[PDB]
Amino acid sequence: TRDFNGTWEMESNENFEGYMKALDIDFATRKIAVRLTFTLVIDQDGDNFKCKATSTFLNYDVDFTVGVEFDEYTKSLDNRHVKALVTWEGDVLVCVQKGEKENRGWKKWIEGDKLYLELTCGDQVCRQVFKKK
Numbered sequence: 524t525r526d527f528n529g530t531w532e533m534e535s536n537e538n539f540e541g542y543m544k545a546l547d548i549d550f551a552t553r554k555i556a557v558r559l560t561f562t563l564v565i566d567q568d569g570d571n572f573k574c575k576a577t578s579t580f581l582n583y584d585v586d587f588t589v590g591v592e593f594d595e596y597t598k599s600l601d602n603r604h605v606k607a608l609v610t611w612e613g614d615v616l617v618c619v620q621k622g623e624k625e626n627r628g629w630k631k632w633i634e635g636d637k638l639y640l641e642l643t644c645g646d647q648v649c650r651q652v653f654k655k656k
């Protein structure tokens with residue numbers, strides 16, 4: 524199933540601290556954000572995605588079409604410009620964010636009814652798991 528539509532509530536968050544530190548998020552912001560539980564609202568229509576991640580402190584939005592490279596300004600996080608491209612590797616949705624940081628991107632997939640989001644930057648990998656609400 525390649526269907527990420529819906530509202531998703533975080534159940535687990537592994538190594539979010541490492542990912543944020545790899546992005547150079549300022550200490551105070553990072554210390555608060557590592558504590559947070561996130562909710563995702565995903566609108567998926569063909570290749571068109573509108574994504575909205577929310578918490579009490581850090582909110583992140585991205586819109587894209589699969590297979591269409593786009594400029595992303597990561598102003599809610601590290602405030603960098605990346606050239607982002609989201610494509611399918613099987614049923615895994617894969618984003619590569621080309622720019623200053625090496626190995627920067629994310630992957631997302633459904634397994635056992637749960638949504639998995641893997642965030643990478645540098646040598647850090649963060650794994651988040653969400654249940655469908």
Ligand SMILES: C/C=C\c1cc2ccc(N(CC)CC)cc2oc1=O
Nearest residue numbers: 563564565574575576583629631642
């Ligand atoms: C799956 C597509 C939409 C979607 C992509 C997405 C990408 C990244 C992201 N984060 C890292 C900057 C915050 C946890 C959250 C996201 O949330 C989404 O809903």
